[PDB]
Amino acid sequence: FVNQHLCGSELVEALYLVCGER
Amino acid sequence: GIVEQCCHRICSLYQLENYCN
């Protein structure tokens, strides 16, 4: 993911990662 | 837009936090 294009399911995966919280 | 910034182009994961609704 480092310096990678984030599209579709992979963008979704990153978004859930960043926005997840306790 | 997130697609233009992160899919079309390269963005850091830090730049995704702006789209946490």
GROMACS .gro file of C-alpha atoms in nm, chain A:
model
   22
    1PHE     CA    1   0.000   0.000   0.000
    2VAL     CA    2   0.301   0.227   0.051
    3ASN     CA    3   0.312   0.457  -0.253
    4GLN     CA    4   0.041   0.248  -0.421
    5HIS     CA    5  -0.277   0.334  -0.607
    6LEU     CA    6  -0.587   0.261  -0.397
    7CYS     CA    7  -0.897   0.173  -0.599
    8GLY     CA    8  -1.213  -0.028  -0.548
    9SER     CA    9  -1.199  -0.295  -0.279
   10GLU     CA   10  -0.844  -0.194  -0.187
   11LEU     CA   11  -0.954   0.166  -0.133
   12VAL     CA   12  -1.242   0.041   0.082
   13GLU     CA   13  -1.000  -0.167   0.288
   14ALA     CA   14  -0.777   0.134   0.350
   15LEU     CA   15  -1.073   0.356   0.440
   16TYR     CA   16  -1.208   0.112   0.700
   17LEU     CA   17  -0.852   0.091   0.835
   18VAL     CA   18  -0.813   0.466   0.874
   19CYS     CA   19  -1.163   0.542   1.002
   20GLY     CA   20  -1.195   0.255   1.249
   21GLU     CA   21  -1.208   0.353   1.614
   22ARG     CA   22  -1.276   0.214   1.960
   0.00000   0.00000   0.00000
